[PDB]
Structure 1
Amino acid sequence: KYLFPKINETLLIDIALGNRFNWLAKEQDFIGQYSEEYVIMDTVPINMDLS
């Protein structure tokens, strides 16, 4: 009735976690506020009415 209670094991159950999107890993230099890009509008060909 007089002993201190004897502890013997802690473990810290721990697992890491994932992304499922890490093949989109694109790095940069972090410069500039805005970024943009562009594309061309189509120009269909024409009837050569050479008159």
Structure 2
Amino acid sequence: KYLFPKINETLLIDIALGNRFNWLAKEQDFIGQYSEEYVIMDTVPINMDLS
């Protein structure tokens, strides 16, 4: 009844976790704050009427 409770070990279970998107990891150089992109609208031809 007169002794201190002896623990024997502890474990620290830990598993690193992934991202599943690191082939999308493009890298900037951290300058500027705006980027921009743009396409051209499609423009179908016409029948040319000489009137």
- TM normalised by structure 1 equals 0.71
User: Which one is further off, 8-17 or 38-47?
Assistant: 38-47
Q: What root-mean-square deviation, in Å, do the aligned CA atoms of Structure 1 and Structure 2 show?
A: 2.2
Q: Deviations over 1:1-51 (max 9, x none)?
A: 111100111010100101111110111111111101222344567889999
Q: Distance in 2 between matches of 1:3 and 1:46?
A: 98
TM-score (norm 2): 0.71
Gaps of 5+ in 1: none
The percent identity for this pair of structures is 100
How many pairs does the alignment contain?
51
